[PDB]
Design a protein around this motif. Structure first.
Motif, PDB file in Angstrom:
ATOM      1  N   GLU A   1       0.792  -1.231   0.000  1.00 32.71           N
ATOM      2  CA  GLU A   1       0.000   0.000   0.000  1.00 32.71           C
ATOM      3  C   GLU A   1       0.824   1.279   0.000  1.00 32.71           C
ATOM      4  O   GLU A   1       0.327   2.317  -0.434  1.00 32.71           O
ATOM      5  CB  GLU A   1      -0.927   0.030   1.240  1.00 32.71           C
TER       6      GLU A   1
ATOM      7  N   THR B   1       3.504   2.188  -1.772  1.00 31.06           N
ATOM      8  CA  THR B   1       4.140   2.600  -3.002  1.00 31.06           C
ATOM      9  C   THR B   1       3.063   3.014  -3.983  1.00 31.06           C
ATOM     10  O   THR B   1       1.946   2.408  -4.008  1.00 31.06           O
ATOM     11  CB  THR B   1       5.095   1.456  -3.569  1.00 31.06           C
ATOM     12  N   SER B   2       3.355   4.000  -4.820  1.00 33.24           N
ATOM     13  CA  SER B   2       2.341   4.547  -5.706  1.00 33.24           C
ATOM     14  C   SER B   2       2.892   4.577  -7.112  1.00 33.24           C
ATOM     15  O   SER B   2       3.762   5.439  -7.435  1.00 33.24           O
ATOM     16  CB  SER B   2       1.958   5.993  -5.312  1.00 33.24           C
TER      17      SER B   2
ATOM     18  N   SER C   1       1.359   5.495  -9.829  1.00 35.17           N
ATOM     19  CA  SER C   1       1.012   6.742 -10.557  1.00 35.17           C
ATOM     20  C   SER C   1       1.866   7.927 -10.108  1.00 35.17           C
ATOM     21  O   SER C   1       2.231   8.756 -10.956  1.00 35.17           O
ATOM     22  CB  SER C   1      -0.487   7.104 -10.445  1.00 35.17           C
ATOM     23  N   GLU C   2       2.182   8.039  -8.824  1.00 34.19           N
ATOM     24  CA  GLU C   2       3.108   9.096  -8.374  1.00 34.19           C
ATOM     25  C   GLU C   2       4.511   8.893  -8.955  1.00 34.19           C
ATOM     26  O   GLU C   2       5.121   9.856  -9.433  1.00 34.19           O
ATOM     27  CB  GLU C   2       3.168   9.210  -6.819  1.00 34.19           C
TER      28      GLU C   2
ATOM     29  N   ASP D   1       4.754  -1.825 -11.183  1.00 39.24           N
ATOM     30  CA  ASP D   1       4.179  -1.736  -9.815  1.00 39.24           C
ATOM     31  C   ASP D   1       4.507  -2.970  -9.008  1.00 39.24           C
ATOM     32  O   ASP D   1       5.002  -2.891  -7.832  1.00 39.24           O
ATOM     33  CB  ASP D   1       2.644  -1.525  -9.948  1.00 39.24           C
TER      34      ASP D   1
END
Ligand SMILES: [Zn+2]
Length: 323
Positions: free
Chosen positions: A26, A28-29, A31-32, A307
């Motif tokens: 959760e 790590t992003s 899209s960022e 991802d």
């Protein structure tokens, strides 16, 4: 005569439980990373170019904004090339520079030189803008844990310049930044004041990411002396999978497969490997179908695979560091 450079032989991970694994998945992003770390690198950036300068500034600024106590060093040097003497600049980012041992994550941040061809520009999206953005995203996602480091063992990121040949690969035209830095580290006493040990004795493991971001990568287990760390990546992939924490992922199409590969792949690990540093070489085999073509671009990247790999790598690094 300290046996400290042998500690990496016995070092064991501190394995995360399910709840910690969910927390990393959760935290790590994709899209960022995509907007903030990757897109600014999707530019022409062969050595000496204005984009190599912009890439280096972006990589340094992204690291500089983090809370952990990173120490940035630019390692700039001259080398002969097929175009004459040129300047190259490796980027090194280190937590606890006097810590005796470091886990090292690395990639190359230059892009292969090509003339523009029918108005297309080579930006080396998998090769290796994505590995660079994965290392930046890992620094960002793990920043609160890494702040705690402020086993005499810490973390170092290296972004090599000049991995690519200006022409086609030859021993004198490729691996400019890695050949230089491996030689410089082998001849630098470490920790400071040491009589007989070098920064290379301090490198517990070099984890080199290259050609990442295409669909369905398969990473072979290249080296017996890092085989037990490759097995840790398999176990982490398998457990994140079983917990439902990966996307569009199956075990039949797992990335870390049981198979060795006898041949030599020329890449930035070579000057380290030849001086006895353990390497975990995260390059897939076969290479992405877009390898060294103008189609190695953003549109051919596979977001959920990147991802998934960010999750596995972040977990590997926490477990290695006991964080
Ligand atoms: Zn390449």
């Amino acid at each position: 005569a300290s046996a400290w450079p042998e500690e990496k032989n016995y070092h064991q991970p501190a394995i995360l439980n399910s709840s910690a694994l969910r927390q990393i998945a959760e935290g790590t992003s994709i899209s960022e990373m995509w907007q903030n770390d990757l897109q600014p690198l999707l530019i022409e950036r062969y050595p000496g170019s204005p984009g190599s300068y912009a890439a280096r500034q972006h990589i340094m600024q992204r690291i500089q904004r983090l809370q952990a106590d990173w120490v940035l060093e630019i390692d700039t040097f001259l080398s002969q090339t097929p175009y004459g003497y040129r300047s190259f600049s490796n980027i090194i980012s280190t937590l606890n520079p006097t810590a005796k041992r470091h886990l090292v994550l690395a990639c190359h941040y230059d892009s292969k030189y090509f003339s523009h061809w029918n108005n297309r520009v080579f930006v080396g999206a998998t090769d290796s803008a994505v590995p660079c953005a994965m290392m930046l995203e890992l620094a960002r996602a793990l920043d609160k844990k890494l702040l705690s480091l402020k086993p005499d063992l810490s973390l170092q990121l290296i972004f090599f310049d000049g991995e690519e040949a200006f022409l086609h690969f030859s021993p004198q035209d490729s691996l400019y930044g890695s050949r230089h830095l491996a030689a410089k580290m082998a001849s630098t006493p470490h920790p400071p004041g040491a009589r007989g040990t070098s920064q290379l004795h301090g490198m517990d493991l070099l984890v080199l990411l290259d050609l990442i971001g295409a669909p369905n990568p398969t990473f072979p287990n290249f080296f017996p002396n890092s085989a037990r760390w490759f097995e840790r990546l398999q176990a982490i992939e398998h457990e994140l999978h079983e917990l439902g924490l990966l996307k569009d992922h199956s075990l039949e199409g797992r990335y870390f497969q049981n198979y060795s590969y006898g041949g030599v792949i020329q890449d930035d690990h070579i000057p380290f490997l030849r001086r006895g540093v353990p390497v975990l070489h995260l390059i897939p085999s076969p290479f992405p179908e877009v390898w060294h073509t103008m189609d190695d671009n953003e549109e051919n990247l596979d977001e959920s695979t990147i991802d998934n790999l960010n999750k596995i790598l972040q977990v590997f690094v926490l477990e290695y560091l006991h964080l």
